[PDB]
Amino acid sequence: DREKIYQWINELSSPETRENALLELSKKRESVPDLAPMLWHSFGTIAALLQEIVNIYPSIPPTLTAHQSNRVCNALALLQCVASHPETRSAFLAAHIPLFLYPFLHTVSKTRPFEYLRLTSLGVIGALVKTDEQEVINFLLTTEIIPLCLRIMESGSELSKTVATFILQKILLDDTGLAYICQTYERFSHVAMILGKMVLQLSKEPSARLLKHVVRCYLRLSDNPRAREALRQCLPDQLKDTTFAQVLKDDTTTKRWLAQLVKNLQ
């Protein structure tokens, strides 16, 4: 596998062999555990994945085709592999690699090629926050991903909403993330206002997974005393009434989180 990896890495340099090498290296992410440092330390490799991404910035009127999106999504998945490896993560953050994905989190395009990109880019960020490492939490705080997550949570696909809510949740769950969001009223209210709108949309178009993650964000906010005092007055009716009785019928975890949340507010 190692010899194939170096050949494919080299084959990224000619445009006739480039796509096939991207797809082949991507297939090795599930089976070669050292693939991330191999990619990170091979001269030019990261630069070649980043080139795939910036080459579609001009495609954001939206002109991205499915072929173009599938190719970049494999570059993104290779970068997710690098984000996930303990030996390469700190340098990925030190090189600000995440900032390259933010245009894909930011576009409002509704085409399916931009949905595949948005989901894979959220996947890269989600792989970082899944580590719960402070370094990751503080980097994302300083780089303004929360406004990007909020806009996606507010009007993305159900699956995009879920991953973005998960990212915001992992930041809320950290003590520094919770303190940061509750440090000013404008920060806290932007998050709570977004969560309230989502609760209203969910009442019309229910999703159990998305409701669970929304409820986790509310539960965690009530650990902060100023957020607790605001949610005493503004917690959506729909989290206390029969709005989600049908959807919660089998979810013991969310019902227990909602009970804990109401108890917290007193």
Binding site: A66, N70, A77, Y116, L122, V163, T253
Partner: peptide
């Protein structure tokens, strides 16, 4: 726009695979 060619299927399967690594459907 409902049309799907091979690249649509591939990209969707890949996004789902990537996101299934996150454990969004875990129950505490």
């Amino acid at each position: 726009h409902m049309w799907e060619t091979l690249d649509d299927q591939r990209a969707l399967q890949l996004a789902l695979d990537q996101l299934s690594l996150l454990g969004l459907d875990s129950d505490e």
